[PDB]
Ligand binder design. Structure first.
Ligand SMILES: *C(=O)/C=C/c1ccc(O)cc1
Length: 124
């Protein structure tokens, strides 16, 4: 899939993509509901993080999968965006829960329709 991390219209290009199409991206992509439950999780993300994309679907990202992100700098920004119904933030972060510390660039952006939210990830 020919889409660049950080592109202005990423939410339109990815909108309603099925699981298989999302696996074609060059960067990690997760779709969350407004409570943080994982709706989609692509192959590129699993390669970065070690998680098995099939097993994490349905888990809560902040409470279960990614406690290192349960902080004002990541979860706090997410929940503020869900509450306001708009989110578009890019920042670096280190993943270090039961894995070798890995620094990444994160882009969180509200999905175009409904009340869903993207978390995009690439290595830095
Ligand atoms: C910290 O606990 C981070 C964990 C994590 C980040 C991203 C993922 O896709 C999975 C787990």
């Amino acid at each position: 899939e020919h889409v660049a991390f950080g592109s202005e219209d990423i939410e339109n290009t990815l909108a309603k993509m099925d699981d298989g199409q999302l696996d074609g991206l060059a960067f990690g992509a997760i779709q969350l509901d407004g409570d943080g439950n994982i709706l989609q999780y692509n192959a590129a993300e699993g390669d970065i993080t070690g998680r098995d994309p099939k097993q994490v679907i349905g888990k809560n990202f902040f409470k279960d999968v990614a406690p290192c992100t349960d902080s004002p700098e990541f979860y706090g920004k997410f929940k503020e965006g869900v509450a306001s119904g708009n989110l578009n933030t890019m920042f670096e972060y280190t993943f270090d829960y039961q894995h070798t510390p890995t620094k990444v660039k994160v882009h969180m952006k509200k999905a175009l329709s409904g009340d869903s939210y993207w978390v995009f990830v690439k290595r830095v």
